[PDB]
C-alpha cells in the first residue's frame, strides 16, 4: 500500500524512537518491494544498515551477521559495518 520510500521513512522513524521491532517490520517490507523491482530512491544498503542493527537489538544474532555481511558487499567503504562484521565473526563463527 505504501511506497518503498514511505515504508523506509516509517522504518527510520521507528528506529529513532528506539522501536526495533517495528523497524524490522518496515525494513523487511522495503526489502520485499525493492526485490519486486519497485522503483525507489532508497537503496538496499541503506535498508540493511537499519535492519541489521534492529535485528541485533532483538537478539537474532546470525541474522544480524548475515545482514551485516550483505551490507558490506553493497557498501564496502562502510567503516562501521566493517567493524561490525569483524565483531560478529569473532563472536559467533570461531
Swiss-Prot record:
Tissues expressed in: Expressed in the heart, placenta, lung and pancreas.
Each TPR repeat, start to end: 45-78
Domain of life: Eukaryota
Compartment(s): Endoplasmic reticulum lumen
Similarity remark: Belongs to the P4HA family.
Assembly with partners or alone: Heterotetramer of two alpha-2 chains and two beta chains (P4HB) (the beta chain is the multi-functional PDI), where P4HB plays the role of a structural subunit; this tetramer catalyzes the formation of 4-hydroxyproline in collagen.
The protein's role, per its UniProt record: Catalyzes the post-translational formation of 4-hydroxyproline in -Xaa-Pro-Gly- sequences in collagens and other proteins.
Pathological condition linked to this protein in its record: Myopia 25, autosomal dominant: A refractive error of the eye, in which parallel rays from a distant object come to focus in front of the retina, vision being better for near objects than for far.
Protein known as: Prolyl 4-hydroxylase subunit alpha-2
Organism: Homo sapiens (Human)
